[PDB]
Amino acid sequence: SPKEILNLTSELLQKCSSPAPGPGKEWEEYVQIRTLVEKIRKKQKGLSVTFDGKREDYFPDLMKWASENGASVEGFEMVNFKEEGFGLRATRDIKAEELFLWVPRKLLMTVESAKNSVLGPLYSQDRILQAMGNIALAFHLLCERASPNSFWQPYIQTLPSEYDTPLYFEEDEVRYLQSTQAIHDVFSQYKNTARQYAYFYKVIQTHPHANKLPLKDSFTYEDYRWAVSSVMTRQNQIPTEDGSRVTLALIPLWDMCNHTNGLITTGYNLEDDRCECVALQDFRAGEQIYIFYGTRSNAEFVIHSGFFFDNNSHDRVKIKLGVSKSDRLYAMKAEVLARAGIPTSSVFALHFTEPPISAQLLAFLRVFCMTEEELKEHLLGDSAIDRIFTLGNSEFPVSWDNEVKLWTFLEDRASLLLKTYKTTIEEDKSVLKNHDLSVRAKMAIKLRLGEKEILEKAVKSAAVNREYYRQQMEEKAP
């Protein structure tokens, strides 16, 4: 019943437009939303458009389409790589820094091609589509998927039919993330996606500029979950045709590369109007070709990329810290932070790779622990180098007293965070070792384990710095 779906989505829109609930209400709100999304989903028949046969059956047509439009198709082939999915495998030796992959702009799906597509009329009227280039790309993808003769059909027919973003997690798979820092961004993703689906289902079914959309016929929640997951796992920022601005884009062929540690070796060539990728390392014939996606955390890889990357050298966990207005020194601390370019309250990161805290966090902690006299002396100074550059540098303390205070705080705070997790490090390792787990469950348990391993490293680093500066104070002659 289309009128029942319209009533259920109206209810879903209102629920997901409520304000954020207080501390400790987030899980039960997520369960409230899952209940209504699942009831809608089980009343619908999955993806509106499906392709018979195997995913690999369509890769030859992708290579042929890419070749005819000026892209590189020589020296690699599309292969199944088990738990990494499909990817590129070298057919011949490829040297590091060798240009081996390129994709002309005509092949890309962009916000610009979305504007000139069947979505164009609705794009020009809808406030959300105009503001959210990633949402516009998602609907561009759904519109072309539902088009029988879309130019990008060879690309769309080779995209995965599902993903491992948390949108696809079962309830108990998300439950593994209770009391983690990452779960809050999982909650947000689910609520955003459900709100957007309900909003656009109403728009597509009622707006006159949507009357000719291929989605007015059928537009299921699974359609929208697939579109946003496709975009978040694969989208890229590229310059516009003249280079004056940037835009979001899906890049066929190149986006089949899987991820490894390294540096970005993909850039846009504006002069030749194409994406270009040089080899991250030497790849021998028969070896998988990897690229480096970007310096993202494992929370970001799980939530936005749908995988957990082992030995992520950029892994980190978010921590929120601020000066309280109850602090009798709030005004002076806020003034010092402003001079340093740091907000009074903000989100920092604790890093896996040494050092565990950045210059920004060290600067904040120093200011947070300054005495009134240290604040006055700092504000009286005016050397440009002392606004932030020395303030965040480990070898330029305010005072040994200040160091002891800030490391004591950081040790206690990282220790406090560890105590709030539902499981310990070794409990997690026992689950991973002795249990048969789904792919998505393993991602969740590895993620919560990784958060705690970072926090314990921060505890031990803060403790040794506290002990070091306490020793320096004790050894100072009286």
Partner: peptide
């Protein structure tokens, strides 16, 4: 080095 580096799956804001 790269005038326009491309980050695969760059994180964007989805809060409309």
């Amino acid at each position: 080095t790269l005038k326009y580096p491309i980050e695969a799956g760059i994180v964007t804001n989805w809060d409309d």
